Structure 1
C-alpha cells in the first residue's frame, strides 16, 4: 500500500489554493505526437473530466478548437476527441478554465451545481442557477451555439 493515493485531482477552479474544496475534477490529459509533420493534441481524458463536471465533452472539446482556432474530431463510437494543433495539458487546462468558470460554475455563487438550457424556437442559450438564484441567456457563442442548437443536451429522468 504505497504511501498516499494513486491519482490526484485539482480544485474545480484554478483560482483557489486550498484543500477545503469538496467537489474535485481529474486533471485532463493531453497527448502529442511528432512535430509539425502532423502534430495534434488528443485529450485522452476528455470523456472522463466531462462526466465529473456532469457535462458532455462536446461542450468543452468544441471550445478548445475555437480558442485554439483549429479543427477538432468527434468520434462517439470510440469516444475519442482530437484537437488540431499542439497544446500541453498544462495549457489546455487554463484554456478550459474559463469555460468551467462560466458554463460549469456560477458567475454569482461559482457553484458547479448549475445547468444549461437550450431554446430551439428562440434559438438562444441560457443557464439557471438555484444555489443563489441566477438566470439569463449565455452570450451567443460563435460556432458552439450552432452545434448546441443542432444537437441539444441530454435529458434526465
Structure 2
C-alpha cells in the first residue's frame, strides 16, 4: 500500500504522496508501548526531523514519547493501535502547513531561536506568516531548531 500525504483531499492526482506509517504494540498492561517503525523514512519523505512528527502525537493524545540513539526506536507510550492514530494521521499537515487560501501543503519553516519566533512560507500561492500561539508544538520547535 501507499497513500496521499493528507486524506482531506480525495483526488487521485494530488501533488503529495508517501509510504504507509506502521507501528508495533509492545509489552503488557500498566507498561504498554507503541513503537513507530517507518518514522525515519516518513520524516525523510516529509522533509522534517523525526522528533517533530513523533512529538505531535504526544501533544494531541496526552501521552509520553521516547527517542533513542542507541537503538533507533521512536515511541509513543500506551496502546495507540488502528483508528487511535489512523483517524488523525493527517494532523501533522492538517493543523500546521495547509494554506488557508488553497489546500496545497508545499510549505517550509524557518526558526529564530534567539527571538522566540517561527516563520512559515507556502510555495503554492505565496502565503506567509508564523505558526499559531495557542497550538502545542511551538515550545518544542524553538528548543530544537531544524538542520
TM-score range normalised by the length of the shorter chain? 0.7 to 0.9
Aligned to 2:69: 76
Whole-angstrom CA distance in 2 between matches of 1:74 and 1:143: 19
Q: Scaled by the length of structure 2, what TM-score is found?
A: 0.85
Aligned-pair Cα RMSD in Å: 2.1
Cα offsets for 1:68-96 (capped at 9, x unmatched): 11110012443321111111144323334
Question: Structure 1 pair 143/103, CA: closer, same or farther in 2 (3 Å)?
Answer: closer
Cα offsets for 1:1-59 (capped at 9, x unmatched): xxxxxxx2111111233322243111211211244242111111111211111112211
More helix by share: 1
Conserved in 1, the CA contact under 8 Å of 2:64 and 2:76?
yes
More divergent stretch after superposition (83-92 vs 48-57): 83-92
Whole-angstrom CA distance in 2 between matches of 1:51 and 1:90: 24
Conserved in 2, the CA contact under 8 Å of 1:72 and 1:84?
yes
Aligned length: 147
Q: Which runs of 4+ in 1 moved over 4 A?
A: none
Q: Scaled by the length of structure 1, what TM-score is found?
A: 0.80
Stretches of structure 2 that go unaligned for 5 or more consecutive residues are none
Whole-angstrom CA distance in 1 between matches of 2:128 and 2:29: 44
Question: Structure 1 pair 44/89, CA: closer, same or farther in 2 (3 Å)?
Answer: farther
- The one of the two structures with greater contact order (alpha-carbon pairs below 8 A, sep at least 6) is 2
